[PDB]
Amino acid sequence: RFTQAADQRFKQFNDSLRFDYRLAEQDIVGSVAWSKALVTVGVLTAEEQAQLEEALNVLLEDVRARPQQILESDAEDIHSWVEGKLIDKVGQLGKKLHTGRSRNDQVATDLKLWCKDTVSELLTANRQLQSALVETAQNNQDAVMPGYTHLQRAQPVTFAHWCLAYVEMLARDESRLQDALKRLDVSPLGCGALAGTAYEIDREQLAGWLGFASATRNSLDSVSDRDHVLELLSAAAIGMVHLSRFAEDLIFFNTGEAGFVELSDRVTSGSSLMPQKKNPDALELIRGKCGRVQGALTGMMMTLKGLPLAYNKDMQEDKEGLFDALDTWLDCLHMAALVLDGIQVKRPRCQEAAQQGYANATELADYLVAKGVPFREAHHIVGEAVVEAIRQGKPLEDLPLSELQKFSQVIDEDVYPILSLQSCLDKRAAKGGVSPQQVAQAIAFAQARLG
Amino acid sequence: LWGGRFTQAADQRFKQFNDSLRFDYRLAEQDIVGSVAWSKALVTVGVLTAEEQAQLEEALNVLLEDVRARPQQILESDAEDIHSWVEGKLIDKVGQLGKKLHTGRSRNDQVATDLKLWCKDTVSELLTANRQLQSALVETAQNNQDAVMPGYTHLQRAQPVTFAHWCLAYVEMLARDESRLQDALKRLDVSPLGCGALAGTAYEIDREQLAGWLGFASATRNSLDSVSDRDHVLELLSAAAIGMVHLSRFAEDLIFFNTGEAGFVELSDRVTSGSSLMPQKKNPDALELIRGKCGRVQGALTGMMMTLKGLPLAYNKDMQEDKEGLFDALDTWLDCLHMAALVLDGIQVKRPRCQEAAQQGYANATELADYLVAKGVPFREAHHIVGEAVVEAIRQGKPLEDLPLSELQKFSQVIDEDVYPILSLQSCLDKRAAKGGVSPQQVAQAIAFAQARLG
């Protein structure tokens, strides 16, 4: 009894179906393609290939329309599940299909086909966040707020420029995904268990049937290679780092202390104890989820580190992490878009905090330096003027001319336009600077580029 | 549990993203048991009458027995989490009374308690699994005291050892895992319940009495810390990570001993796969999976560290990410401890091959240096001398013992016919007579000591 329990434990420990069912569709189209290779190589007649294709097409439509059926079976993995469902439709012809093929090059192929499908969905979700960000930017070009270094008020910025910062981060995530795609777009099918098919299959022809751009150059490498999962996990970890920063900023902007931003009821939840709470749960989950992506990355690295060639059962650990991390990344991309959709920027509070920063003390200092006051003395004087202004509870620009002239006689009426928030924005007029004219052009450039 | 502050419902995609039920239902028993203890705190302080508490306990116990019978039923609900699920089922059963149970409590409070209760049970199981492995290793050692084999450093033939000694090496690793689990359990055996959402319950509850009801050793000293603390998850993950490193080395060793090249070990069919064509080759499936599974435990560790890093006080929603990581990592560690034990029974050590290999690679060269020392030759000099003898032995393709005396005396004139008994396999073992050494008497003393420590 406890022997049987132990054997059943071993079967659960060993089996992969419960996560690799996720590869059903890829295993099936992969099988279609192999079947054609076998014809070129004289194992299958053209008729057996058509019957096999027919049964695989029916199975594909059935898995699409009801994926939950796979997990009803006690098959050990999908390859064996698909094989079993093939034999029901076609008899021993569904075993003959595995001729010249191994589970090692089979799963390598399925996995890369899955990555292609998934990178595609990630590219879309990523482009959608960019577009959500750019749209948010368009509607908040007038939202002047404090920029931050060290979480201290620095030169003022606009909410729009803040959005386009994340657009840029996301644009690099997009090219990272594109590059990973091109690099993984190589068919490992026809590589046998480790040393190649024992048939004269045309692997480049086979790759074409699979939709891959070329075939792998080395069978040992083909069966042992999981770079694409490491690289996709890297891309995801960096993407999630981006989203964790976005979340951190929005959560600060969302504090009662800041009051910069109000989030929608759709994307927010309450407290079981505290009747007033409206918490940024979605933003917090997005940053909390950075860790599981990172863990998936670390785990895959550790799994592959020190692993001898060619194939090893350790490599069955390549899927759960990848699946979880890419699902997470996709969910976070969607959720970040959703948060933006309902966001309200509280413009007066943003501007009030911008003005309580005294960044224009700089502009005062070199107004004075431009008027001839020595550097050291200029800074001393503005320092004094700033202390007095906070004592009176007003911005520098709010001091009457008679008051400012007590700090330096050279200050005149022309000081006031030079101290304005608008003036300080308009000076940053180089590419990527925060002047409204530049931000406006960046939004337009991103609209055109994003479609 | 909330909604009065809200004018609009959650978006469907937010609900799927935010809900914890699909995994926190694992805490059902703990949640209900904590709720019972909380109902008692509430009497103490006038929120509930004695008969109201008795009535809540009845309904909670019904839920407990229902949930024990088929936990899966929980997942039929669209409840946000296990806490809302319990409260909702209480209300169905007792009406308005069910709306009273959450007085003075928060989910921050509740989940912190539920998770520590679950850790206690899980650590216990890990401890049990760790001890069976130790004791399975000890028994394998018992039965393989005579299996001289090569010892390795750098995967190079070092000095002879025995398979018993190898086994006991892993016993020592596991015993430190065991003590790490015990120390972690002590630190975590502290009740956070009664700390509200961060600042305390607004009630004169006796939190040490509450701890007693829950089976904890004491109550936490600071509400802010209590609702925000996940040290115990990091500490358990880190113990699991170390434990999994040990298992990965165990895996690496056996997979190596199982090669056609070594041939030291035959494993059971129960734990391997292979082909009827080549019944000699067994793929070490369980072992490969044990070492492969090290990563996900390492990943859970890194992941929880990252999620906790830079988080302000007190509770934050990020902390909902603790459970999935911990569940996976401790389940993995438990399964690997069980499979390691499964691999050990029916394992067979192939003695003739082990012994043959133990006599190769000039693994007796230390004995010659030591022999030179005993004749007065400074160890460093002896070492150099023997190294050169090895270079000549390699050149002749002979073991040191097969070098004629006249040849050996070219290296040192002090060498006489008594080197030869010193080069034997049995003498390599006998000479290592200090504690933790490989002599037959030391290994026997170590086996007997491990048997006593574990019995």
How does this model look, in words?
Two copies of one chain form a homodimer. Chain A contains 21 helices and six strands. Chain A is mainly α and 451 residues long. Chain A has three domains: 1-101, Fumarase C, Chain B, domain 1 (Orthogonal Bundle), CATH 1.10.275; 102-356 and 428-451, Up-down Bundle (Fumarase C, Chain A, domain 2); 357-427, Fumarase/aspartase (C-terminal domain) (Ribonucleotide Reductase Protein R1, domain 1), CATH 1.10.40. Chains A and B meet through α1, α12, α13 and α14 of A and α1, α11, α12 and α13 of B. Chain B: Pathway: Amino-acid biosynthesis; L-arginine biosynthesis; L-arginine from L-ornithine and carbamoyl phosphate: step 3/3. Chain B: It is an enzyme of class 4 (lyase). Chain B: One of its GO terms (biological process) is L-arginine biosynthetic process. Chain B: Keywords: Amino-acid biosynthesis, Arginine biosynthesis, Cytoplasm, Lyase.
C-alpha geometry of chain A: elongated
Helix and strand sequence of chain A = HHHHHHHEEHEHEHHEHHHEHHHHHHH
- Number of separate strands of chain A: 6
Number of domains as seen in the coordinates of chain A:
3
Tally of helical runs of chain A: 21
PDB class: lyase
Keywords: E. coli, Aspartase, lyase
Assembly: dimeric
Entry title: Structure determination and refinement at 2.44 A resolution of Argininosuccinate lyase from E. coli
